[PDB]
Amino acid sequence: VADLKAFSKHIYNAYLKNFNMTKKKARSILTGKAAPFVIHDIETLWQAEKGLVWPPYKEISVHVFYRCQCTTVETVRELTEFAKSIPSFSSLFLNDQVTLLKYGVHEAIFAMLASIVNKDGLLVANGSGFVTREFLRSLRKPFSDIIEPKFEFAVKFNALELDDSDLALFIAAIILCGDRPGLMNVPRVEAIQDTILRALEFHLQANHPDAQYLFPKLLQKMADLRQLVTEHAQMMQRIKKTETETSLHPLLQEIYK
Amino acid sequence: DLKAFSKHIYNAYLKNFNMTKKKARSILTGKTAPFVIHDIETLWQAEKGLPPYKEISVHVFYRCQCTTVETVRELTEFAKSIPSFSSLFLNDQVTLLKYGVHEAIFAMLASIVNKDGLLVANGSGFVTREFLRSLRKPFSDIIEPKFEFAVKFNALELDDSDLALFIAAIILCGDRPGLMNVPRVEAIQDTILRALEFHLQANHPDAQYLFPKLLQKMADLRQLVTEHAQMMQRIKKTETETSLHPLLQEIYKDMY
Numbered sequence: 251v252a253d254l255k256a257f258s259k260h261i262y263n264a265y266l267k268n269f270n271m272t273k274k275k276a277r278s279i280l281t282g283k284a285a286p287f288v289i290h291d292i293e294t295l296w297q298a299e300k301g302l303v304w305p306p307y308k309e310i311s312v313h314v315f316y317r318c319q320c321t322t323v324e325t326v327r328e329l330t331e332f333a334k335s336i337p338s339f340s341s342l343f344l345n346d347q348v349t350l351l352k353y354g355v356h357e358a359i360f361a362m363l364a365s366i367v368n369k370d371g372l373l374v375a376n377g378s379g380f381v382t383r384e385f386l387r388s389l390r391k392p393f394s395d396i397i398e399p400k401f402e403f404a405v406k407f408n409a410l411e412l413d414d415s416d417l418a419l420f421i422a423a424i425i426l427c428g429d430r431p432g433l434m435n436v437p438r439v440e441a442i443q444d445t446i447l448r449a450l451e452f453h454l455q456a457n458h459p460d461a462q463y464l465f466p467k468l469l470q471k472m473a474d475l476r477q478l479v480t481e482h483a484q485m486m487q488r489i490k491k492t493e494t495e496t497s498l499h500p501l502l503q504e505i506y507k
Numbered sequence: 508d509l510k511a512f513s514k515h516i517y518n519a520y521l522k523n524f525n526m527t528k529k530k531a532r533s534i535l536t537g538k539t540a541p542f543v544i545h546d547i548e549t550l551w552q553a554e555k556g557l558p559p560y561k562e563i564s565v566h567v568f569y570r571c572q573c574t575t576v577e578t579v580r581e582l583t584e585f586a587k588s589i590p591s592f593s594s595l596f597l598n599d600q601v602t603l604l605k606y607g608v609h610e611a612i613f614a615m616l617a618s619i620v621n622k623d624g625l626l627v628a629n630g631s632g633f634v635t636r637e638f639l640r641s642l643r644k645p646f647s648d649i650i651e652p653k654f655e656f657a658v659k660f661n662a663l664e665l666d667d668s669d670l671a672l673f674i675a676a677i678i679l680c681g682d683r684p685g686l687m688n689v690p691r692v693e694a695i696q697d698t699i700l701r702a703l704e705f706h707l708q709a710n711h712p713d714a715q716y717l718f719p720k721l722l723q724k725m726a727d728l729r730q731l732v733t734e735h736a737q738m739m740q741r742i743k744k745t746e747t748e749t750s751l752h753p754l755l756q757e758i759y760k761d762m763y
């Protein structure tokens with residue numbers, strides 16, 4: 251009992267230590283209590299690229315696509331240090347850690363993306379900018395069809411009203427997953443995953459005591475997250491096939507191979 | 508600062524390797540004597556006072572995989588202690604270790620070996636080379652070539668300060684297949700080799716042609732592991748009864 255309480259406290263500390271944007275910091279900005287420069291067209295995007303403190307320019311949709319890859323690459327840096335900060339994770343052999351991150355970071359990215367989003371847009375560049383969803387909708391396909399489902403997911407996910415102490419356990423349960431293809435020491439990860447999910451439902455009882463059925467709802471979001479990454483990797487197969495102009499970051503080439 | 512770079516790696520070496528060449532040379536010269544293992548009985552005694560048992564040759568082969576698995580644990584933390592290495596994305600770290608740990612292992616074996624055998628079990632035992640030769644093929648064909656290299660490598664008379672820079676150059680190799688950030692690695696390797704060459708002329712001022720000799724040993728090690736990888740693959744096909752540690756199954760999966 252007092253082990254899961256200590257486990258939750260340590261994972262939450264890793265979370266706050268390594269991630270650049272909490273859901274608390276983002277709700278502060280999106281409610282005007284922390285103003286981000288609104289990016290809604292080519293005009294404000296060019297000003298942002300000159301004014302905001304953040305490859306050959308091919309076009310507008312491809313430029314935004316490169317900005318998205320930067321976010322992913324940077325978040326993967328943080329997601330590594332978050333998982334490395336978990337002793338059970340660092341105990342695994344280093345190649346099993348890569349297997350977990352390879353199949354794990356994108357599920358965790360789309361969950362954390364809900365933490366910096368309302369139904370009208372998202373926060374970019376350390377919270378100093380707000381890119382409207384309608385401007386993202388107006389990009390040309392496939393780049394439009396890639397971004398839009400992440401909003402539709404982030405809206406339904408934000409209905410559960412999790413805070414950062416909830417997400418730290420939730421994201422940790424995402425990475426420490428025994429279902430990953432090619433895992434060397436499978437039952438070891440399954441044991442770690444069970445400890446975190448137990449720690450999650452225990453923390454959900456204390457922090458969200460009146461919320462009924464919250465834990466089985468979160469498990470469903472973990473299933474919805476596997477589908478979202480499945481469909482995402484399918485659209486990435488299309489970008490590498492039809493978009494000969496767009497280059498792909500080497501870290502994303504390794505993930506989608 | 509190259510002077511600080513070499514000193515940091517030498518610190519990570521002492522910080523992560525229980526058995527240094529300095530410690531091992533004390534035990535092999537006489538300044539507690541190791542328990543000599545030369546037959547089945549002394550091996551049996553050592554298992555008490557120092558996987559399903561198939562036979563003796565496979566049992567020793569199982570205890571060799573234990574040393575490799577443990578030495579890979581130490582090498583991982585040694586590489587992680589090099590801050591330039593930790594900045595690499597985790598997948599690139601694995602690639603360097605995957606194709607590098609065994610070149611590093613076969614070089615570090617020479618630190619605990621004389622012409623008559625090697626130290627085992629944290630230095631509390633000495634396994635003879637004739638007892639390793641007495642094992643049946645292919646287990647005898649896998650171990651003896653390591654002795655040949657280990658004795659020729661000991662002729663360079665390196666100490667731990669040299670080996671620390673030598674091991675770091677093996678791990679941080681730009682030629683590893685599947686490397687993501689190739690230029691970054693090639694830069695780090697170039698820094699270590701500069702630090703090694705600079706450290707060699709200061710520590711071995713009279714050693715003629717020492718640095719280009721060590722570069723030949725690095726190529727020699729790449730040949731030894733390639734030959735060692737093939738022998739392991741034939742074992743995985745011929746010997747159904749002998750099981751491989753999953754960490755070695757991942758390493759030898761693609762080595763040709």
Ligand SMILES: CCCCOc1ccc(-c2c(C)ncc(C(=O)O)c2C)cc1CNC(=O)c1ccc(C(F)(F)F)cc1F
Pocket residue numbers: 289295313314315317318319321322359363364367372374375381396397400401404486502
């Ligand atoms: C609920 C939120 C949905 C939107 O968020 C999404 C959705 C999908 C992706 C994505 C894409 C498109 N392609 C490949 C991958 C992959 O990693 O496989 C990923 C993860 C990225 C973001 C994150 N976006 C950004 O951070 C961002 C940054 C700057 C700008 C700016 F316009 F100002 F320049 C625009 C931006 F949108």
Ligand SMILES: CCCCOc1ccc(-c2c(C)ncc(C(=O)O)c2C)cc1CNC(=O)c1ccc(C(F)(F)F)cc1F
Pocket residue numbers: 544550566567568570571572574575609612616617620625627634649650653654657739755
């Ligand atoms: C110059 C030194 C040469 C000998 O050292 C060698 C050579 C090859 C290997 C090896 C093998 C056989 N197979 C696969 C791999 C692989 O990793 O691919 C490796 C690296 C291991 C050792 C290290 N030996 C031991 O540590 C050891 C431990 C206990 C016992 C005991 F008998 F007491 F139980 C005997 C031992 F020899």
Ligand SMILES: CCCCCCCO[C@@H]1O[C@H](CO)[C@@H](O)[C@H](O)[C@H]1O
Pocket residue numbers: 343344345346348349579583601604605754757758760761
């Ligand atoms: C900790 C020591 C590091 C050595 C581990 C050996 C590396 O294994 C490799 O892990 C990769 C995914 O992680 C796989 O894609 C490769 O097929 C496999 O060869």
Ligand SMILES: CCCCCCCO[C@@H]1O[C@H](CO)[C@@H](O)[C@H](O)[C@H]1O
Pocket residue numbers: 326330348351352501503504505506507596597598599601602685
């Ligand atoms: C920091 C997160 C790292 C995640 C990057 C994704 C990992 O890439 C994979 O790395 C393996 C060896 O390194 C290769 O065998 C695989 O073919 C490759 O796809």
